[PDB]
Structure formats: C-alpha cells, structure tokens
Design an enzyme around this catalytic site. Structure first.
Site, short mmCIF file in Angstrom:
data_model
loop_
_atom_site.label_atom_id
_atom_site.label_comp_id
_atom_site.label_asym_id
_atom_site.label_seq_id
_atom_site.Cartn_x
_atom_site.Cartn_y
_atom_site.Cartn_z
N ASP A 175 -7.73 4.61 2.36
CA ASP A 175 -6.44 3.95 2.29
C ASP A 175 -5.70 4.09 3.62
O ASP A 175 -6.33 4.34 4.65
CB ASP A 175 -5.69 4.48 1.07
CG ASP A 175 -4.79 3.45 0.41
OD1 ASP A 175 -3.90 2.97 1.12
OD2 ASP A 175 -5.06 3.09 -0.79
N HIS B 299 1.05 3.31 1.24
CA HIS B 299 0.21 3.01 0.08
C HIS B 299 -0.67 4.22 -0.28
O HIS B 299 -0.80 4.54 -1.45
CB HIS B 299 -0.72 1.80 0.26
CG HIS B 299 -0.12 0.47 -0.04
ND1 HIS B 299 0.95 0.28 -0.89
CD2 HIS B 299 -0.40 -0.75 0.47
CE1 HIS B 299 1.29 -1.00 -0.91
NE2 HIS B 299 0.48 -1.65 -0.09
N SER C 102 -3.94 -2.43 -6.33
CA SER C 102 -4.03 -1.15 -5.63
C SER C 102 -3.59 0.02 -6.52
O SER C 102 -3.97 1.17 -6.25
CB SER C 102 -3.18 -1.15 -4.36
OG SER C 102 -3.72 -2.13 -3.47
#
Ligand SMILES: [Ca+2]
Length: 356
Positions: free
Chosen positions: A42, A105, A289
C-alpha cells in the site's frame, strides 16, 4: 467480544452491523489472529500511530522512484514510512486527474487488518493480535508494477535481488490497489510465487463500476478478489463486479449512507501533505480498498485459529474456498449483471467451518 474502543460502537458498523458487518464480535470470541503476519502492500504506514503501535513490523519500501516515494533516492529501503501521496495540481498524474490530499490509505488499511483493540483508544481492528508487515509500494500518483511484483515476492518470503531476506514471511497479502489491464506475466508470476509459498493473496476488485476482468490484480488467477458492500449489505455505487469477484467485504456506500454509515473507520491522519502537516486521527474512507482488508483479516483469524489448535494452516485455494462458501448471502438482491461474489465475508462462519 464487545471491545472498549471509544469510537467502535458508533462508527464501526462494518465490524458489528447485523446486515452489513462481518460478524467480528462473535469471531473475536474464537480468534484475534495472534501469530499470523499480514503484509499490507500500500501507501506505507504511520508507524507511531498510537492505535497501531505494538502490532507493526518494520516492513520495507519497494518504491524505486524518488519522485514517487518522496524519498531522497530511487533506492528501496527498510521501513515503510508513508511520506504522503498528495498531488498538488490537477493533471499531474494523467490527463484529467484531480489534485488530492495525502490518503494515508495504507495506515487505514493496516487499521482494518490489526488496529489495536480493547485498548481504550480509538477504533477496533479485525485481526487485532496479528502483526502487519507494511510494504510500501504506492506513492505520489500511485506505483510501478515492477515494484508491486517484487513486493509480492518479498512479502510472501521469496527472494528479491537487492533486498535482505524477509524474516517475517506473511500468511496473507492484502493489495488494496488496482489499475487498468488484464493481469500480465509479471503480476501473475509474482502472485503464483506467493501462492506457492502458502500465502493467500487478497485484492480489491476496483472502484470503476466495471467488470473486474478488465483490471489488475483483480483479474489475476489465484487471488481472492473482493467487491464492496454498503451498511445495507447491498452493492456500493462504485464496486467493480463480474465472475472474477469471489465475495465482498464492507467498503462503505459513501454519501448516500451518510456519516458514519457510508464509510469504513480506522487509524489515519488529517495531514494534507507530509505526516508533519497534520496529526494522528481516525478517518472514514470508502472503497474496495476498505473491503479487501476485512477479507484479508478474516483469512488471518482462520490461520491463527488453526495454528492454535495444532491444525495445519489452509493452503491458498482452500482459504478462498472457505471464505466464499462461508460468506453471508447478501441481505439485498444483487443485480444479475453485477455479481460481487457469494456474499459478505463472515468472520465467525469462516472460523466455525475451518475448525470443524
Ligand atoms: Ca483501539
């Protein structure tokens, strides 16, 4: 288990809601994922977030472009500090892209995976006794396939030229990331390598309201491809779909479902650029996600449970089979042309079936 995290009850429907949640309270009576490592490929991590400290490994940053990694050189380096993936101006990324603040994220995803739980702080996480191995692959304007592929190899305990041996090979890789194009050889080989090492690879289906077959790694062979459901348990407006999608997790429906019910809530930052520009916080985000790591974490709960009872870990195909077969069927009809798998991952049902 009803953990005492202050924001859990009001915010974390994706953990405990009866229609849209993944049945975490019940699952947590059996397993919290202790002894398992989940690699989160990520944007990197905020390693000192006070609701994550203690569940993180150092990890590594595979981004081999200084301008993407925001680091001083193109080297790959130990650690996965997220430098911030903000883009200041429209179009910097590609024709028509929109400027955006840093996502954090990977910190949010890492939270879904193993945010510290029952600690009187913040939010809860699914496999909250597992460890997250953050492997930073995404930066400004995203990442490079070659970096992501090597990251898969390393995270799963394979050898990569120029990187020290991974002391902590992961039972599960989560890739909350995607892009146009059917899976290739480079992607496919890395994934096949991970599978061959016993690593289950869980990926986001993508957010283009399109067929997952047209995206990677969503369309790769051998992966668990995860669509996104709302608090209502129905398909999100953005979820990708199609026969490649194996099952769903809570991704959050966005504004139609309001606040908090439209968003998945985890550790992050309000920093708009550099970590330093903001502070530790809890962020509500929506996407495939956010769906993927619920599924990845459930895999980790299952492996942990088995290892605890002397049992063998499931192999990748068995894991996917179990996740699909034990998914809760959708409480809202899914349109025939937009299938998103067998149901919503069910942490408790997965556990029950694996421990039979
Ligand atoms: Ca907490």
């Amino acid at each position: 288990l009803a953990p005492n995290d202050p924001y859990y009850q009001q915010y974390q429907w994706h953990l405990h809601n009866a229609t849209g949640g993944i049945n975490a309270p019940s699952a947590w009576d059996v397993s919290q994922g202790e002894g398992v490592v989940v690699a989160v490929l990520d944007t990197g991590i905020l390693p000192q977030h006070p609701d994550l400290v203690g569940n993180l490994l150092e990890g590594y940053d595979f981004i081999s472009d200084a301008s993407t990694s925001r680091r001083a050189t193109n080297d790959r380096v130990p650690g996965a500090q997220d430098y911030g993936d903000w883009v200041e101006n429209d179009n910097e990324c590609y024709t028509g892209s929109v400027a955006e603040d840093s996502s954090w994220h990977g910190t949010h995803v890492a939270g879904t995976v193993a945010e510290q739980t029952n600690n009187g702080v913040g939010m809860a996480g699914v496999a909250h006794k597992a460890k997250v191995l953050p492997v930073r692959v995404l930066g400004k304007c995203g990442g490079y396939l070659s970096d992501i592929a090597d990251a898969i190899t390393w995270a799963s305990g394979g050898t990569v030229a120029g990187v020290p041996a991974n002391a902590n090979p992961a039972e599960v890789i989560n890739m909350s990331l995607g892009g146009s194009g059917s899976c290739d050889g480079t992607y496919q080989d890395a994934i096949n390598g991970a599978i061959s090492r016993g690593t289950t690879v869980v990926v986001a289906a993508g957010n283009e309201t399109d067929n997952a077959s047209k995206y990677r790694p969503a369309s790769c062979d051998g992966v668990v491809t995860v669509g996104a459901t709302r608090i209502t348990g129905g398909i999100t407006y953005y979820s990708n779909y199609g026969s490649r999608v194996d099952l769903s997790g809570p991704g959050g429906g966005g504004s139609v479902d309001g606040n908090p019910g439209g968003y998945v809530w985890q550790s992050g930052s309000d920093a708009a650029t550099t970590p330093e520009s903001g502070s530790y916080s809890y962020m509500g985000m929506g996407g495939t996600s956010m769906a993927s790591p619920h599924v990845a974490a459930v895999a980790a709960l299952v492996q942990s449970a088995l290892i605890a009872a002397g049992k063998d870990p499931l192999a990748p195909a068995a894991m996917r089979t179990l996740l699909k077969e034990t998914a809760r069927p959708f409480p809202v009809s899914i349109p025939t042309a937009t299938p998103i798998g067998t149901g919503i991952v069910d942490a408790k049902a997965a556990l029950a079936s694996a421990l039979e």
